[PDB]
């Protein structure tokens, strides 16, 4: 990080946030979104709720 507006606020940061400038980010984001939604719809919901209308 090289902040021009603040003289001296120049440093390096260690982070675990997934990169945004890569060439797949949105693509696997959509993939995992769909996969987890399907998992909830098919497994988790029916084995955590009992209301017949919800089922």
């Amino acid at each position: 990080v090289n902040d021009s507006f603040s003289p001296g606020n120049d440093f390096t940061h260690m982070t675990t946030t997934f990169p945004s400038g890569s060439t797949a980010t949105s693509t696997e984001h959509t993939a995992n979104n769909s996969t987890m939604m399907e998992t909830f719809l098919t497994v988790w919901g029916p084995e955590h709720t009992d209301d017949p209308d919800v089922l």
């Binding site: 120049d10 440093f11 390096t12 940061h13 260690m14 982070t15 675990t16």
Partner: protein, 675 residues
């Protein structure tokens, strides 16, 4: 007599180093009997071949190579380029070439539009002139056969294996890659009684493969693959000889420069647990402990004998504990499973007397962790109840060249961050009983969560983890961030942690390691007294930490210790009697008007004099100086110092304390210290 060993062998380096002695072979007095082959070029050729083909067929083909017979590849340019090269210097045309082509080639005239030369040019084929041609489609087995029979093997491609490649024409005609390592200039050795190489072969029944090193423990991965495939395919037709047999073969009738400091010899130790409660003996179990360096074994004298590994108080002895920490684990010999030692004296499975039997596997490894690429602080993740205080004491009690490696002031425990908070984390988490429903105290909380066998019910633990996660996430993390930040600003230190997750969430900067020990740690938590919330509470807290930790393999703890100790004593063996002024050096940040040290160096005079001419000034930092008994702080702007600037040679201190001799400046470090 060709003998294959599971290591890379070179003509000069393997002669300089005691490779056979490293494996355990007895000395051969005069070395005229043995000669070493060089297979590094063969190995990189193997990698190049693997880039194109499959591993199995290339390995199978290379098995049938006779290393006692010389042969070379001759690389030819493409067809057209060969035609122009023959058009020039027309003495190069062989007699096999067609008479019409030869005469037309001597035309010494522009032959583009003669069309007779042109129809001849379409008619020409390189295989007509040269019979053995690889042609970039030949199988590796056929390559090896043509290399075995004959001396010159012509080829039109560079993806070959087995021998040196010599150009046939000037480099201008060749448009291929500049693989000068295997390709020599265009223009242009007897064997001793014993020849030592790397790759085993089955060409002749005078070949041998050396045993004594387990195929699992081979360091070099390509050699591991080669040995695995060979042993799995041709198991029944291989001649295996012990190192003792090799030594006897070497000494049947006769008997009647810069050195790397990061290479060590390790052995596997075999021992048995013995109960001598009565005057009689009872053998309980057979254990093997892996990867024990030989130098520590020689230092702490260990022979084939009987030892007691407990003191009068009832705890493990320091030497045994250090040896176990240095090793990479213990395996049961009957049931091939990892064994965890019970630290306590609780009757089930107490080890009190051991009997050493022998050592079997001996080879050389590299203590370099291979991730320590830049000089940075070190953060090690180790669970609770891992003899941390004892390890700290033993480390602080070490000093070799008046250096005092690992002072206690240069390490920080995993509990200071918790202690800094005004309500410290332990008594902070002792109020989860308020949050949880149906439980009115810490005591009955523990009784509820734990079973009668002191094992946590998964469902109850998950609820407790649900309650625990917020506090660990929103209180400990910012304080940990602040602590690691100002610690980094103050200097380079070693930081212990209970889980890698807290470091990851606190954004720790520096190398990160996961370590484990071959012990049942929870027994220590249960046995030791002086607990804030109780041994049971500490047990539950350890379970919470293990759940909090993420999914990753913890390496064995000895990996750090080998790097930490072994190079220092190895360098001591060399420069123990040298002049300290000539053999000592130091690097640090310099300020014009000051010198704040960064890394301390010990090395021979030669190594020091090449380290003298390095451009340390390429690195910059900012220094703030305060007035205590004198204190300074440094922040590095830019990249860090690459470790190989210090190089494999010379031994350096791993931790530093920014403290000038007992205002803001911009500093460039320099190699100020010298003779």
């Amino acid at each position: 007599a060709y003998i294959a060993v599971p290591a890379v062998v070179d003509s000069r380096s393997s002669e300089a180093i005691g490779l056979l002695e490293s494996f355990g072979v007895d000395a051969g007095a005069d070395a005229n009997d043995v000669s070493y082959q060089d297979h590094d070029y063969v190995l990189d050729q193997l990698q190049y071949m693997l880039d194109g083909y499959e591993a199995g067929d290339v390995i199978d083909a290379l098995v049938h190579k006779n290393w006692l017979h010389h042969s070379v590849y001759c690389l030819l340019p493409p067809k057209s380029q060969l035609l122009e090269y023959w058009k020039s210097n027309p003495s190069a045309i062989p007699d096999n070439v067609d008479r019409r082509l030869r005469k037309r080639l001597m035309l010494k005239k522009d032959l583009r539009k003669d069309d007779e030369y042109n129809q001849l040019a379409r008619a020409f084929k390189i295989s007509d002139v040269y019979a053995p041609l690889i042609s970039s489609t030949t199988s590796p087995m056929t390559m090896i056969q043509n290399l075995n029979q004959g001396e010159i093997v012509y080829t039109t491609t560079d993806r070959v294996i087995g021998a040196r490649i010599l150009l046939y024409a000037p480099r201008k005609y060749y448009a291929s890659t500049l693989s000068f390592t295997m390709t020599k200039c265009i223009i242009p050795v007897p064997h001793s009684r014993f020849n030592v190489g790397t790759f085993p072969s089955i060409a002749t029944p005078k070949c041998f493969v050396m045993s004594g090193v387990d195929i699992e423990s081979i360091p070099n991965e390509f050699i591991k693959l080669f040995y695995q495939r060979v042993k799995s395919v041709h198991a029944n037709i291989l001649n295996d000889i012990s190192p003792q047999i090799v030594s006897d073969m070497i000494n049947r009738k006769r008997l009647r420069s810069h050195v790397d400091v990061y290479k060590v010899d390790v052995v596997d130790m075999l021992f048995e647990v013995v109960d001598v409660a009565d005057g009689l003996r009872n053998v309980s179990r057979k254990l093997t402990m892996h990867t024990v360096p030989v130098c520590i074994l020689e230092m702490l004298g260990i022979e084939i004998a009987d030892y007691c590994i407990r003191q009068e108080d009832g705890m493990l002895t320091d030497w045994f504990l250090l040896l176990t920490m240095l090793s990479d684990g213990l395996t049961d010999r009957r049931t091939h499973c990892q064994y965890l030692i019970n630290p306590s004296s609780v009757p089930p499975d107490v080890i009190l007397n051991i009997s050493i039997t022998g050592f079997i596997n001996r080879h050389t490894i590299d203590v370099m962790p291979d991730i320590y690429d830049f000089v940075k602080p070190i953060g090690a993740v180790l669970p609770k109840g891992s003899f941390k205080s004892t390890i700290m004491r033993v480390l602080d009690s070490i000093s070799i060249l008046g250096i005092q490696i690992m002072p206690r002031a240069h390490v920080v425990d995993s509990d200071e961050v918790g202690e800094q908070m005004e309500p410290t984390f332990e008594q902070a988490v002792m109020e989860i009983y308020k949050g949880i429903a149906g439980v009115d105290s810490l005591d009955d909380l523990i009784k509820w969560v734990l079973n009668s066998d002191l094992i946590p019910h998964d469902d109850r633990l998950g609820q407790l983890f649900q309650a625990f996660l917020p506090l660990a996430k929103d209180l400990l993390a910012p304080m940990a961030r602040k602590f690691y930040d100002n610690s980094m600003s103050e200097g380079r230190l070693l930081t212990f942690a209970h889980a890698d997750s807290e470091l990851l969430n606190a954004n720790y900067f520096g190398h990160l390691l996961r370590l484990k020990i071959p012990y049942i740690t929870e027994v220590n938590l249960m046995i030791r007294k002086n607990r804030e919330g109780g041994e049971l509470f500490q047990l539950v807290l350890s379970y919470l930490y293990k759940m909090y930790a993420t999914s990753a393999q913890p390496k064995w703890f000895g990996s750090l210790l080998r790097l930490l100790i072994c190079p220092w004593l190895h360098m001591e063996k060399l420069i123990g009697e040298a002049d300290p002024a000539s053999t000592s050096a130091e690097i640090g940040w310099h300020i014009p008007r000051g010198f704040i040290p960064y890394v301390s160096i010990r090395a021979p005079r030669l190594v020091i004099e090449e380290l003298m001419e390095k451009n340390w000034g390429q690195y910059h930092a900012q220094v703030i100086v305060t007035d205590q008994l004198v204190s300074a702080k440094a922040v590095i702007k830019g990249n860090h110092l690459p470790v190989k600037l210090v190089s494999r040679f010379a031994c350096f201190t791993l931790t530093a304390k920014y403290e000038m001799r007992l205002a803001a400046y911009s500093a460039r470090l320099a190699f100020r210290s010298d003779l």
